[PDB]
């Protein structure tokens, strides 16, 4: 079939690993420097954490091939399970020698680093989760994402998603015949 869904998941894995490093969701001791898209990134070497990120994106992949993803959101939650930050990846797919996709995806990875300079430091003890905004309403077909048997998905509710008048931090916008994608941050006032 077509493959831009394959490169988006590996990109999202790299982006999630980097966000956990830049926003300091996990200690530096579990991160190691790797190269992806010819840029240095900090990848997690924690096995259980890696299996969670991979199991999450292994279910997102079939939805990308079907063109059923508006947004993939990484949500940082404080110790009271309240969203303090949201990294929103708005995704649009318009109708193989394509390192152009990688050089375009590499620019999104390069932008994530600036979050250390423009965002205020998160409270200690934060956790994270991933929100997937399907194009077709998720309530219509809940089984489409249940591709891994021991990794079930549920509908989020407003406590996991809602932030009261959050500050919007635009990071990067890209439009192309290949890929259209925006990355921005919804930050709590605090």
């Amino acid at each position: 079939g077509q493959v831009v869904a394959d490169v988006l998941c590996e990109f999202l894995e790299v982006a999630v690993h980097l966000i956990l490093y830049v926003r300091e969701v996990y200690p530096v001791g579990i991160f190691q420097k790797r190269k992806k898209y010819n840029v240095p990134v900090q990848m997690s070497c924690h096995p259980e954490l890696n299996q969670y990120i991979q199991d999450t994106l292994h279910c997102v992949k079939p939805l990308l091939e079907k063109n059923d993803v508006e947004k993939v959101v990484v949500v940082i939650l404080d110790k009271e399970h309240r969203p303090v930050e949201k990294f929103v990846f708005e995704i649009t797919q318009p109708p193989s020698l394509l390192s152009h996709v990688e050089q375009l995806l590499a620019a999104f990875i390069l932008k994530i680093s600036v979050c250390d300079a423009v965002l205020d430091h998160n409270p200690p003890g934060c956790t994270f989760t991933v929100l997937v905004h399907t194009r077709e309403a998720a309530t219509r077909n809940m089984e489409k994402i249940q591709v891994i048997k021991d990794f079930p998905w549920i509908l989020a509710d407003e406590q996991d998603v809602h932030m009261h008048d959050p500050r919007l931090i635009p990071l990067k916008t890209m439009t192309s015949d290949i890929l259209k994608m925006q990355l921005y941050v919804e930050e709590r006032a605090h």
């Binding site: 508006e70 003890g125 905004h133 994402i145 079930p152 998905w153 509908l155 998603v161 921005y184």
Partner: peptide, 23 residues
């Protein structure tokens, strides 16, 4: 800059039932 898909309270997103390991 404008977000393409503003926050819609009607169409709730999906979330993994499990939680990542604590730091």
């Amino acid at each position: 800059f404008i977000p393409w898909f503003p926050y819609d309270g009607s169409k709730l997103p999906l979330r993994p039932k499990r939680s990542p390991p604590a730091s």
